[PDB]
C-alpha cells in the first residue's frame, strides 16, 4: 500500500478489521421481502446486521446474511462495469 503498487488502506481495513456496510443504489440493503431484507430477520428491522452492515473482516469470515449482502454489492459493481463500457464506447466514437 505505502509503495502505491497495489491495494489501499480500505483494503487493509476490510481484510483485518471490518468489511463495512453493503449498499445498493446508494442506500442500505432494501426490503426486498415484505419489510424484511431476508426471512431470517423480524419485520421493520432497521439494525446494522439486518440492513447490510458486515461486521466481520475477510479473515474472520462473512456470516451467510453478510455473504448475501456482499454478493448484492458485488453484483451492483459488475452491472456498473458492463453498462459503463457499453455507454462510453458510443461517446468515444461521437467525440472522435
Amino acid at each position: 500500500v505505502v509503495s502505491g503498487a497495489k491495494g489501499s488502506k480500505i483494503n487493509i481495513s476490510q481484510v483485518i478489521a471490518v468489511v463495512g456496510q453493503q449498499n445498493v443504489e446508494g442506500k442500505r440493503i432494501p426490503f426486498g421481502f415484505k419489510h424484511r431484507t431476508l426471512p431470517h430477520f423480524i419485520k421493520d428491522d432497521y439494525g446494522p446486521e439486518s440492513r447490510g452492515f458486515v461486521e466481520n473482516s475477510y479473515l474472520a469470515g462473512l456470516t451467510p446474511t453478510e455473504f448475501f449482502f456482499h454478493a448484492m454489492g458485488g453484483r451492483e459493481g459488475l452491472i456498473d462495469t458492463a453498462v459503463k463500457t457499453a455507454e462510453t464506447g458510443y461517446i468515444q466514437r461521437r467525440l472522435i
Partner: protein, 630 residues
C-alpha cells in the same frame, strides 16, 4: 432427550443433505418437468383439441388415448436405439407417439394406435432407455453412470433446455408507470392452465390528474371500468360498488370511485355497454347485434379466462374484476405497497415440460389444420379419405426437432435450447441447472440484473456471467427445486368440504370481515376462520395428504387473503420445521438416515414425517426462519 445436541448438528445436517441428494440428485427439475410433460401434458393437449368436423355426409374425428413407445430407430425393422448410438450416428433420440382415432359419420370405426410423430426423449427420464439401470448396466451401454441426463440428443448433438423466467400468471400486480397517462395500473396475465391459450393480459388503470379505466384484450381503445361491469350484467351502482368496495364504512374509496361512475353516466343498460365495448374491437362489427355478440364473446373468452371461460360465470368474473379495482384503489390509497417486478414470488420458471407443451400445442394445432386441409380436399369429390394419408407426422416431428436443434422457440425467442457444455463436469451440471431472464441484453436497466433479496436459497448469488448477460443468466441453487405443477382440484374439494363458502353463494357484505381465498390466482370464496384453516392446510401438506408437498399456501395476514398455488414454475427449497423453538428433526431421524441403504429410510420418509417441507418464495414472505438451531 431426542434433540440433536449442537456438537452433533453438523453431522446431522450433512446426513440430511446427503439423503436429499441421494434421493433427488441435481437435475430433478429437468427430469421431473419432462416426465410430467410426457405423462400428462401430451394427453391433455391431445384431448383438449376440439373434435374436428367436416361436412351432405358429415363426419367427425376424435383423439382419445396417447401411447408412447420406447426410443426406437428404423429402411428396415424397428430396433431399440441406445443414446450413445444416437450420439455417434448423428440421430435424434426420439420415441414414437401413437394415438387412437375414432371416426363417426352413422358408422363408427377405430383406428387404434396410429403413428402421429416422434417425441425426443430427455435422457435418464422415465421414458428413456437408461431409466432404472444400474451402474454396471450403464457401463455395458458405454454410458457414464455419473452422467446426470436431463438433456436431449438432437441429430447427435446434446441439447439442454434453459429454464425460461416469466411473470407469474393469474395474479394481480399493481405497478406505477412513470410520467404516463395512468398513475397506477393493475395487471393480471390471466391464463387457464391445462388448456394454455395465448395468455390474456388485462390492465385496470387509473388516469393521472382520477378515473379508473380498463384496458381490454382485442379492444383498441381504453374502456371505463363501470361500462365493463354493466356489460357483465350488473346494471346498478349498489351491485358494482359491492363488487368493488367491500366496506361501506370507508368513504375514501367512495371518493375515488366518484369519477368513474360520473363518467359512466351515459350508459345504464347492459346491451348499451356491450355495444360500447364492442364498437372498438379488433374486428369492428357491421351492425349492432354483431357488435354485441362480439363483445359478449370477448367478455366470455378473452377477459379473465382463468376465473372462468364458459357461460354463466359472469358473477365470478365480476368479483375478480372488482378485486382488481379494489387492489388498484388500495395502491392509490397507499394501504397496499406497490408490487415488485423482481420479486421471485411473482415469477415462474418455464422448464422443459411447459416449453415442450407450448411447442406441442402449436404443432398439434398445425397437424389438425392439414388434417382439415386433406379432408376438405377429399370431401369435395365425395370420396372417403385415409387417415394415414391425412396424418402428417413430418410437420410435428421436424418442427419439434428443429426447435430443439436451433433453439428458436415456436414456428419468436431464441437461445431456449443450447448445446450442452461438456468441457468439465461442473460446467455440465451448471448448464443443466441454468435459468434465463428474457430481458433484452442491450438494455441499461440495472433492476432486472440486480441481485434481489428473494433469490436467497433459490438462485446462486455468485454464479452469473460477467459479460452483457450479467444478472440475467442465473443458476439454480443446489437444494432449490422448481415445482412441477399439479391439479388444484383436491384442494378445491377439501376447501368446499371445510366450511369455505363459494363466491356465488354469499352476499357481498360478508367479504369485509372474512378472508379471501385464491387457488392458483382464482378467487374461489371466503373463509371466516383463516388461522385454523391455514393450520389444517399445513397439517395436510406435512402429512403427504391430498395436498402434495410442492403446493404453496400463503396467508397474507395484514390484508385478509389466503393464496394457494399449485401450478408449475414455482421455485422452492426444503426447510426444517421449527415448532415451539424446537426442531421437529430428532435424533431418531438422523439415526434412520445413517443406515440409508439398509432400512430404506429416505428423504421422502423425512418429508412424509412432517420434518421438512418445501417453502417457495411467496411462502417465504410469511416464514420466520432460523439460520442455525443455535
Amino acid at each position: 432427550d431426542d434433540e440433536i445436541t449442537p456438537d452433533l448438528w453438523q453431522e446431522a445436517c450433512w446426513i440430511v443433505i446427503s439423503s436429499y441428494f441421494d434421493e433427488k440428485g441435481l437435475v430433478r427439475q429437468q427430469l421431473d418437468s419432462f416426465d410430467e410433460f410426457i405423462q400428462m401434458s401430451v394427453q391433455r393437449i391431445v384431448e383438449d383439441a376440439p373434435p374436428i368436423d367436416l361436412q351432405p355426409p358429415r363426419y367427425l374425428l376424435k383423439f382419445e388415448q396417447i401411447y408412447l413407445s420406447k426410443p426406437t430407430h428404423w429402411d428396415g425393422a424397428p430396433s431399440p436405439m441406445m443414446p450413445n448410438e444416437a450420439r455417434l450416428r448423428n440421430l435424434t433420440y426420439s420415441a414414437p407417439l401413437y394415438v387412437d382415432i375414432t371416426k363417426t359419420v352413422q358408422l363408427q370405426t377405430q383406428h387404434q394406435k396410429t403413428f402421429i410423430g416422434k417425441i425426443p426423449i430427455m435422457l435418464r427420464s422415465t421414458y428413456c432407455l437408461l431409466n432404472g439401470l444400474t451402474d454396471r448396466d450403464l457401463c455395458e451401454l458405454n454410458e457414464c453412470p455419473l452422467d446426470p441426463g436431463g438433456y436431449f440428443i438432437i441429430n447427435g448433438s446434446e441439447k439442454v433446455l434453459i429454464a425460461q423466467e416469466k411473470m407469474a400468471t393469474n395474479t394481480v400486480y399493481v405497478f406505477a408507470k412513470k410520467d404516463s397517462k395512468y398513475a397506477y395500473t393493475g395487471e393480471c396475465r390471466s391464463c387457464l392452465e391445462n388448456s394454455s391459450r395465448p395468455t390474456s393480459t388485462i390492465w385496470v388503470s387509473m388516469l393521472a390528474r382520477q378515473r379508473i379505466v380498463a384496458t381490454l384484450p382485442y379492444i383498441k381503445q381504453e374502456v371505463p371500468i363501470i361500462i365493463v361491469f354493466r356489460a357483465l350484467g350488473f346494471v346498478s351502482d349498489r351491485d358494482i360498488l359491492e363488487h368493488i368496495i367491500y366496506d361501506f364504512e370507508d368513504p375514501e374509496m367512495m371518493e375515488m370511485v366518484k369519477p368513474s361512475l360520473d363518467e359512466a353516466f351515459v350508459i345504464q343498460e347492459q346491451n348499451v355497454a356491450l355495444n360500447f365495448i364492442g364498437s372498438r374491437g379488433a374486428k369492428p362489427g357491421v351492425t349492432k347485434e354483431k357488435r354485441i355478440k362480439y363483445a359478449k364473446e370477448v367478455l366470455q373468452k378473452e377477459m379473465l379466462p382463468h376465473v372462468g371461460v364458459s357461460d354463466f360465470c359472469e358473477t365470478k368474473k365480476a368479483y375478480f374484476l372488482g378485486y382488481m379495482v379494489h387492489r388498484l384503489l388500495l395502491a392509490a390509497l397507499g394501504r397496499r405497497e406497490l408490487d415488485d417486478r423482481d420479486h421471485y414470488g411473482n415469477k415462474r420458471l418455464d422448464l422443459a415440460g411447459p416449453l415442450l407443451a407450448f411447442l406441442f400445442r402449436g404443432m398439434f394445432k398445425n397437424l389438425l389444420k392439414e388434417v382439415r386441409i386433406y379432408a376438405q380436399k377429399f370431401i369435395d369429390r365425395g370420396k372417403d379419405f385415409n387417415l394415414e394419408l391425412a396424418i402428417k407426422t413430418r410437420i410435428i416431428s421436424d418442427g419439434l426437432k428443429y426447435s430443439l436443434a436451433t433453439g428458436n422457440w415456436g414456428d419468436a425467442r431464441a437461445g431456449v435450447s443450447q448445446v450442452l457444455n461438456r468441457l468439465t463436469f461442473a460446467s455440465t451440471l451448471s448448464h443443466l441447472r441454468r435459468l434465463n431472464s428474457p430481458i433484452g441484453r442491450d438494455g441499461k436497466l440495472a433492476k432486472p440484473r440486480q441481485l434481489h433479496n428473494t433469490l436467497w436459497g433459490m438462485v446462486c448469488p455468485a454464479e452469473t456471467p460477467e459479460g452483457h448477460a450479467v444478472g440475467l443468466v442465473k443458476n439454480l441453487a443446489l437444494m432449490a427445486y422448481i415445482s412441477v405443477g399439479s391439479q388444484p382440484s383436491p384442494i378445491l374439494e377439501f376447501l368446499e368440504e371445510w366450511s369455505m363458502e363459494n363466491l356465488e353463494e354469499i352476499s357481498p357484505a360478508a367479504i369485509a370481515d372474512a378472508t379471501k381465498i385464491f387457488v392458483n390466482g382464482c378467487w374461489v370464496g371466503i373463509h371466516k376462520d383463516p388461522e385454523q384453516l391455514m393450520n389444517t392446510l399445513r397439517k395436510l401438506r406435512r402429512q403427504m395428504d391430498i395436498i402434495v408437498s410442492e403446493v404453496s399456501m400463503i396467508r397474507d395476514i395484514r390484508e385478509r387473503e389466503i393464496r394457494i398455488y399449485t401450478d408449475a414454475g414455482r421455485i422452492c427449497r426444503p426447510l426444517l420445521i421449527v415448532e415451539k423453538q424446537k426442531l421437529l428433526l430428532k435424533k431418531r431421524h438422523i439415526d434412520q438416515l445413517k443406515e440409508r441403504e439398509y432400512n430404506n429410510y429416505s428423504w421422502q420418509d423425512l418429508v412424509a414425517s412432517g420434518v421438512v417441507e418445501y417453502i417457495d418464495t411467496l411462502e417465504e414472505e410469511t416464514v420466520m426462519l432460523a439460520m442455525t438451531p443455535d
